[PDB]
């Protein structure tokens, strides 16, 4: 009924203070995507709204940068950051798809 | 149909306190992020809080940061705005806004609570 | 903070004519810039979002553009239900501001 699948970059090990992209992509599926979303259980970071283009959420403006693709750039880690990403496709007519990604921002 | 109903405001005198309520109807609420802006007699539009889906994160501007509290029960449908140590320039119609689930902006309003502060 | 001006904080403009509203930015805020029409009495109600994108409901006479510190309201075919003040929002970064208004007085 709902066939299309979601692989992602991977869950993440990162040493404090770098820079790191994750990204989601559907595959096996033809539905219309019209928006995809990337939170924190409790957060929304970006929005890339089908015609619009990206919004970066205000309170995360200089931590996320957009792209590549459907993907985040996040920017300056800190062991903060370190949680569940997901990657919440909204799409027509099939419907919501969502992935997840695993970061934890060490201090070796 | 979406609505959002607010009750609370009065007068109340300068030092003291009041909370307002605003109570959601026609969308989950807990799915939405909620603001109260504020608008002195016959000026313009003042950001005053701001509140996560879920409780845990809250931003204000400097203006009123530390005197006003911004909670929400998911359970009742009911956002609150706490205000302490009110002065006179907080005289005010105060509105809650949800937020767009499409960008980060105010999607629809509350029609508002009036607010004086005066001895 | 991320000034926002609007001026003129006033325009009359006759019916059936086109009204530009401008509004300013202290610093480059993309397009995270929204648009709000209050009526006396009335809560905003919010008229486009993401620089020009039209709110549901929201008759096609208006429309906005702008992107980095230059954003423009344009109310075609001006009506008598028109009359109000118009509000500009930046929602690039934190503390979110409003602009101060403009009031479109109908020149009958």
């Known amino acids: 009924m709902m066939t299309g699948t979601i692989e992602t970059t991977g869950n993440i090990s990162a040493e404090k203070g770098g820079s790191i992209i994750l990204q989601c992509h559907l595959s096996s599926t033809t539905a219309q995507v019209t928006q995809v979303n990337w939170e924190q259980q409790d957060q929304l970071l970006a929005i890339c709204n089908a015609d619009l283009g990206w919004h970066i959420s205000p309170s995360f403006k200089d931590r996320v940068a957009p792209g590549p693709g459907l993907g985040l750039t996040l920017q300056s880690l800190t062991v903060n950051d370190t949680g569940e990403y997901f990657c919440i496709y909204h799409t027509y007519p099939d419907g919501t798809y969502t992935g997840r990604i695993f970061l934890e921002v060490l201090e070796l | 149909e979406v609505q959002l109903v607010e009750s609370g405001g009065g007068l109340v005198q300068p030092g003291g306190s009041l909370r307002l309520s605003c109570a959601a109807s026609?969308?989950?609420?807990?799915?939405?992020?909620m603001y109260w802006v504020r608008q002195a007699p016959g000026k313009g539009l003042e950001w005053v809080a701001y509140?996560?889906?879920?409780?845990?994160?809250?931003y204000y501007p400097d203006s009123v940061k530390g005197r006003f509290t911004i909670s929400r029960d998911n359970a009742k449908n009911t956002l609150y705005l706490q205000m302490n140590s009110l002065r006179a320039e907080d005289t005010a119609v105060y509105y809650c806004?949800?937020?767009?689930?499409?960008?980060?902006?105010?999607?629809?309003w509350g029609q508002g609570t009036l607010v004086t502060v005066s001895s | 903070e991320i000034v926002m001006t609007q001026s003129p904080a006033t325009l009359s403009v006759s019916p059936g004519e086109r009204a530009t509203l401008s509004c300013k930015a202290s610093q480059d805020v993309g397009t995270s810039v929204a648009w709000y029409q209050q009526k006396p009495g009335q809560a905003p109600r919010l008229l486009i979002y993401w620089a020009s994108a039209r709110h549901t409901g929201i008759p096609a006479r208006f429309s906005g553009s702008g992107s980095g510190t230059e954003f423009t309201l344009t109310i075609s075919s001006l009506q008598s239900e028109d009359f109000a003040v118009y509000y500009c929002?930046?929602?690039?970064?934190?503390?979110?501001?409003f602009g101060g208004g403009t009031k479109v007085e109908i020149k009958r």
């Open positions: 509140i996560t889906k879920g409780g845990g994160s809250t």
């Open positions: 929002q930046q929602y690039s970064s934190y503390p979110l501001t």
């Open positions: 026609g969308f989950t609420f807990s799915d939405y992020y």
């Open positions: 806004a949800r937020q767009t689930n499409y960008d980060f902006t105010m999607d629809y």
